[PDB]
């Protein structure tokens, strides 16, 4: 059902995809240890935002590791190229994982925005429903990336509608609650918005690769885009979320945060 299955791969193509996925694992588990260790410097009100980065790191790291082993299981070097064996490789599993990781990314943002109570629960609920709409409709569309490109486009448009509405919820909350934020993080949080707009848009671009580059180099491009997108949307984003948490914590008087920021 997926374009990866259509092609044989050069050793270069195959080894590059393997290295991209493997590097992805390493970056996410490296960042995991950073988040774990810095969490002690985060005030209770925010500490779950840092814990969510740990959860996203393992989740994304495990999907990348899964993809990497599936890639090596699926292909063997036969008659001068890597050819499909009995097991299959697919990006479908990333979609399933987004059902968990996207809500985690959105919740960590709501936490540092100082939302709480009813507003937090209601905002999270609408964001998660929009996210799930996006992800499910996209998952369905990509089943057609070989057999019916028109269907892939239409499901893609539906998904993009959910995306745009989600992004409008996010920006609305960010630009409304920016003024509650401490320690100068009212400025930092605007950069977080733009980082999300940029990084998250890489996913629909990857989605469309079967429409504009249906060949083995397109397969490579798609994995490359997911790699850039994962690192930006999870790791760089989590690092900014954690900086914001620690800075707000120190401004609120949490002494471990003040001491951590002091000794750097
Ligand atoms: C860490 C993983 C992240 C942030 C994943 C984000 C995924 C998206 C923003 C996906 C969006 C899509 C569209 C807007 C249209 C095409 C189908 C999807 C699901 C790829
Ligand atoms: C936020 C940035 C994240 C960067 C992650 C990506 C790093 C890897 C960069 C690779 C550059 C391209 C290498 C050349 C491709 C060879 C093509 C081939 O034969 O398949
Ligand atoms: C197994 C694959 C290769 C091993 C990867 C190990 C190298 C890790 C490099 C970067 C990971 C990013 C983690 C960011 C932590 C904070 C960075 C910082 O404080 O500047
Ligand atoms: C990776 C494996 C070793 C990591 C163990 C880190 C312990 C952190 C302790 C702490 O921050 O309280
Ligand atoms: C809530 C979901 C809304 C879905 C709208 C339907 C448009 C996509 C259906 C395409 C079906 C088809 O191409 O046969
Ligand atoms: C070359 C350009 C690549 C730059 C990639 C960005 C890498 C890491 C940024 C992590 C976020 C750091 C927190 C912001 C600190 C602050 O606002 O003072
Ligand atoms: Cl607190
Ligand atoms: Cl993920």
Residue numbers in the entry: 2 to 265
Tell me, in the authors' exact words, what the paper reports.
In contrast, the NTQ rhodopsin functions as a light-driven inward chloride pump (called ClR). Here we report the atomic crystal structure of ClR from the flavobacterium Nonlabens marinus S1-08T. The ClR structure comprises a short N-terminal helix, seven transmembrane helices (TM A–TM G), a C-terminal helix and three loops connecting the transmembrane helices on both extracellular and cytosolic sides.
The type A and type B crystal structures were refined to a Rwork/Rfree of 15.40/19.38% and 17.84/22.24%, respectively. The final type A and type B crystal structures contained ClR residues 2–265 and 1–266, respectively. The retinal adopts the all-trans conformation in the ClR structure. Cl−-I, which is located 3.1 Å away from PSB, interacts directly with PSB by electrostatic and hydrogen-bonding interactions. Water molecules inside the ClR structure indicate the presence of three internal cavities (IC1, IC2 and IC3). The C-terminal helix of ClR is also amphipathic and its hydrophobic interface, formed by Pro257, Ala258, Ala261, Leu262 and Ile265, interacts with an oleic acid located on TM A.
